Ligand binder design. Structure first.
Ligand SMILES: *C/C=C(C)/C=C/C=C(C)/C=C/C1=C(C)CCCC1(C)C
Ligand SMILES: *C/C=C(C)/C=C/C=C(C)/C=C/C1=C(C)CCCC1(C)C
Ligand SMILES: *C/C=C(C)/C=C/C=C(C)/C=C/C1=C(C)CCCC1(C)C
Lengths: 229, 229, 229
C-alpha cells in the first residue's frame, strides 16, 4: 500500500524455491515412499502464496479501528492441520485398523485451530486474553494424555516405533509451545513494541518451524533403499 | 462484562465435566467400544468452548444495525456433520466397497447446514423467508426418500440391522424437525418471546439434542462384552 | 425488491427438474453405475440453490461502494473440487494403496480455488491484477506436469485407460482455461462492459461446463453390463 515493505514478498520467493528443491531432489525416494515429499511439497506451496498477500496488503479488513489478521490465521488453517498429519504418515507406513490415534489427534486439532482463529480476529484485547488461555488449556490435557502412551501404549505394539516417535514429539512440543510464548507479551498481545516488528516476528517463526520440521522427517527414517522391481 | 448473561458460561462448565466423566469410566466402556466414545468425545468438547464465547459476547458482528449470529451456525457446522456421521458408524462396523449410502447422506447434509448457514446471516427479514423454505425443501425430499428404503433396501442386506436403524431415524427426524419448528415464526422461536429467552431456547434444544443421541447410541447396540485377548 | 434479473431464478428452476429427470430414469442409467450418478447428483442440486440466491440478491455485500461476489466463488469452493473428483473416480474404479495421483491433483486444486476467492474478494483493480497471475501461474506448472505423464506414466500402467484419460483432460483443459480468458479483460477486470453482462456471462459458462462434462462422463465409458441377479 505504502511500499517500502518487501518483507512478506521476499518470504514468497523463499517458499517457492523451497518446493522446487524437491523437484530436482526427486533422485531421492527411489524405491521408498514418494508420497513423503509429496505432502511436504504442498505445505510450503500454499503457505507461500499466503505471505505473498500479506505483502500486497490483500487480506486485512478494518473493523472498529482494529485491523483483523484474517489471512494470518487462514494460512494456519491449512498448513498446521497438514503439518501434524504429515507426522501420522511418517510413522504409519501402512494403516487398515480403526481410527483411534489419528482420530483423537485430528479432533483436538480442530479445537486448537479454532483458538487461533478468533485469537487474531479479536477486536478487544480483554476478550483475547481469555481465548488465548483456552488454546493452551486444550493443548495441556492432550499433551499429558499423549505423554504416557508415547511408550506405554506401544509397549505391545512396537518398541522400535516408540523410540522414533519419542524424539518426534519432542520437537513438535517445542514449536507448538513456541507461538503461545510470543503471544504472552509484546505486540498483538500486551507490549510496547511497534506493530511493525509484530509481523516481522510471526514471519520468521513459521519459516523456522517449517525448515526445522523438514530436516526432522529426513532424520526420522535415515535410510536409502534401492528396490522397485 | 456489562451484559447480564452468565448462562452461556455455565453451559460450557457442565460440558467440560461431561467429557471428563468418560475419562474416569475408561476403566471399562459400556454399550459401545472405545472408538465410539472417541467421536462422541470431540462433539461436546468443541461445542463446549463455543458456548463459552456466547457468554463473553465473542461471535457477534453489527452490520447496518442488524446483528449476525455467525458463531451460532459455526457450532452447528461442526457438531451437526459429526452427528450424522457418528450414527453412520454406529450401524456400519466395517467398510470396503460400500460408500454409496454414506455418500448420499453426507451430500444432503451439506445442503441442510447451508440453509442454517445463511438463515442466521440474513440482513433482511424478507429474504430470510425465502432461504428458509429452501432448507425445509431439501429436507422434505431426503426424508420421504429415506423413509421407504429404511426397510425396503435392507430387506436383503440385513433385516436385523433394519429394525435398529428404524429406531435411530425415529429420534433423528423428531430432532431435525424440531429446529425448523421454532424457525417458523417469532424471533427464532414460537413467538411472543423476548431476545433473552430466544438464545435460551436455542441453548437447551442442542443440549437436549446431544444428550438424546448419547443414550441413544448406547441403547442402540446393547451388547456388554468382555473380550480383549 | 425491485426485480430486474430473473435469470438466476430460472437457472435454479431448470436445475431442479434436471436432477429429477434422472430420478425417474433411475430404472436404468446411461452406462455409468448408480454411484457415478450419486456424485453427479449433488453437483447440480447444490449449484441450483446457489444461483437461486443470486436472484433474491442474497450473497453480495456493499463495501466501499464496491460489490462483492461472495456467493460466486462459494460454489467454486465445493462444486469445483467435485467436478474434477467425479472424473477421478470415473477412471479409478478400485483403490487400495496409492494416494499418489489423486493426492496430487487434489492439492493443486486447493491453491487454484484460493486465488479464485480473493479474485472476487479484491477491493482494488490493481491488486486483483497480481492475484490473478498467481492463479494462472500455478495452473501452468501443474498442467505441464500432467501432460508428460498423461501417456508416459500410463505407458506401463494402462494403455487403454491412458487413451480414455487423454480425451478427458482435453475438454477439462478448455473449460479450466475458459474462465481465465474472460477474466483478462472486460468487467471485474478492467473493461467498458456493463455489469449486467458480467453476471450474464459468468452464469452461462458454468452451465456450459456442467452440461459439457456430464455428457463427457457418459461418453468416457460407454458400456453396459448387467450382473446383479
Ligand atoms: C507453519 C505454521 C505453524 C505450524 C503454526 C502453528 C501455530 C500454533 C501451533 C499455534 C498454537 C496456539 C496454541 C497452542 C494456543 C492458542 C494460541 C496459538 C494459536 C498460538
Ligand atoms: C447439535 C446441533 C444440531 C444437531 C443442530 C441441528 C440443526 C438443524 C438440523 C437445522 C435444520 C434446519 C432445517 C432442516 C431447515 C432450515 C432451517 C434449519 C437450519 C434450522
Ligand atoms: C462449475 C464451475 C466451475 C467448474 C468453475 C471453474 C472455475 C475455474 C476452473 C477457475 C479457474 C481460474 C484459474 C485457473 C486462474 C484464474 C482465476 C480462475 C479462478 C478463473
Amino acid at each position: 500500500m505504502n511500499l517500502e515493505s518487501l518483507l512478506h514478498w521476499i518470504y514468497v520467493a523463499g517458499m517457492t524455491i523451497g518446493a522446487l528443491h524437491f523437484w530436482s531432489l526427486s533422485r531421492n525416494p527411489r524405491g521408498v515412499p514418494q508420497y513423503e515429499y509429496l505432502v511436504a511439497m504442498f505445505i510450503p506451496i500454499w503457505s507461500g502464496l499466503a505471505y505473498m498477500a500479506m505483502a500486497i496488503d490483500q487480506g486485512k479488513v478494518e473493523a472498529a479501528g482494529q485491523i483483523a489478521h484474517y489471512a494470518r490465521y487462514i494460512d494456519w488453517m491449512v498448513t498446521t492441520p497438514l503439518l501434524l498429519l504429515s507426522l501420522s504418515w511418517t510413522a504409519m507406513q501402512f494403516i487398515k485398523k480403526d481410527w483411534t490415534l489419528i482420530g483423537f489427534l485430528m479432533s483436538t486439532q480442530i479445537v486448537v485451530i479454532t483458538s487461533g482463529l478468533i485469537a487474531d480476529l479479536s477486536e478487544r484485547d480483554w476478550v483475547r486474553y481469555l481465548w488465548y488461555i483456552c488454546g493452551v488449556c486444550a493443548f495441556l490435557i492432550i499433551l499429558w494424555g499423549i505423554w504416557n502412551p508415547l511408550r506405554a501404549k506401544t509397549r505391545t505394539q512396537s518398541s522400535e516405533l516408540a523410540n522414533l516417535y519419542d524424539k518426534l514429539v519432542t520437537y513438535f512440543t517445542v514449536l507448538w509451545i513456541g507461538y503461545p510464548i510470543v503471544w504472552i507479551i509484546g505486540p498483538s498481545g500486551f507490549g510496547w513494541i511497534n506493530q511493525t516488528i509484530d509481523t516481522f516476528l510471526f514471519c520468521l517463526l513459521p519459516f523456522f518451524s517449517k525448515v526445522g520440521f523438514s530436516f526432522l522427517d529426513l532424520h526420522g527414517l535415515r535410510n536409502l533403499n534401492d528396490s522397485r522391481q
